[PDB]
From a paper:
Pygo contains a single zinc-coordinated [name] finger in its C-terminus, by which it binds directly to a short Lgs domain [called homology domain 1 ([name])]; Lgs in turn uses its homology domain 2 to bind to Armadillo, thus forming a ‘chain-of-adaptors’.7,10 How Pygo and Lgs assist Armadillo as a transcriptional co-activator is unclear. Vertebrates have two orthologs of Pygo and Lgs: Pygo1 and [name], and [name] and [name]/[name] (referred to as [name]), which contribute to efficient β-catenin-dependent transcription in human colorectal cancer cell lines with high Wnt pathway activity. To our knowledge, Pygo [name] fingers are the only ones whose histone H3 tail binding is regulated by a co-factor ligand, namely, the [name] of [name] proteins: human [name] [name] significantly increases the affinity of human Pygo1 [name] for H3K4me, while Lgs [name] is essential for H3K4me binding of Drosophila Pygo [name]. Here, we explore the molecular mechanism by which mammalian [name] assists [name] in binding to histone H3 tail.
Given the emerging physiological differences between the murine Pygo paralogs and the murine [name] paralog, we measured the binding affinities of all four [name] and [name] combinations for dimethylated histone H3 tail peptide (H3K4me2) by isothermal titration calorimetry (ITC) and found that the complex between [name] [name] and [name] [name] (PHDPygo2–HD1B9L) has the highest affinity for H3K4me2. To further explore the underlying molecular mechanism of this communication, we solved the crystal structure of the human PHDPygo2–HD1B9L complex. The purified complex yielded crystals under multiple conditions, and its structure was solved at 1.9 Å resolution. The overall structure is very similar to that of PHDPygo1–HD1BCL9 (with a 0.593 Å rmsd for the core Cα backbone  compared to that of 2VPB13). Like other [name] fingers, PHDhPygo2 binds to two Zn2+ in a cross-braced conformation involving two pairs of anti-parallel β-strands, followed by an α-turn and another β-strand flanked by two α-helices. It exhibits two distinct protein-interacting surfaces on opposite sides: one for histone binding and another for [name] binding. HD1B9L is a compact domain that consists of an N-terminal β-strand, followed by two α-helices connected by a short loop that allows folding back of α2 towards α1. The main difference between the structure shown here and that of the PHDPygo1–HD1BCL9 complex is the presence of an extra helix (α2) in [name] [name] that was not properly formed in previous structures, perhaps as a result of crystal contacts. Secondly, α2 is positioned so that I258 and L259 are in contact with the base of the A1 pocket, namely, with [name] residues T371-A375, which flank the connecting loop between α1 and β5, apparently buttressing the pocket. α2 is thus an essential structural feature of HD1B9L, directly supporting the A1 pocket base of PHDPygo2.
Residue numbers in the entry: 326 to 389, 235 to 266
The structure:
Amino acid sequence: LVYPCGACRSEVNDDQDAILCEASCQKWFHRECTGMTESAYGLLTTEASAVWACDLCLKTKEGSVYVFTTHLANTAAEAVLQGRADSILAYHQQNV
Ligand SMILES: [Zn+2]
Ligand SMILES: [Zn+2]
């Protein structure tokens, strides 16, 4: 099969950091095509109860587990790294 990046349209390969808009548009995105940080990527992909939503799905409220936009994933991860949140789910819980 082939999996075109939802933003740049080239193939997303297994050796590339990538996230899936799995609860909506069903497209893979290269991490660097989304604005997501490395830390947000590492923490979100490790959390099986978390799903990510891409910017185009957010724009039309497509589809309307814990849901993170790129911005929420970034800020939750920064709080984790700073020792200000115990985990990205704990941050989501507190902040919505
Ligand atoms: Zn891409
Ligand atoms: Zn999407």
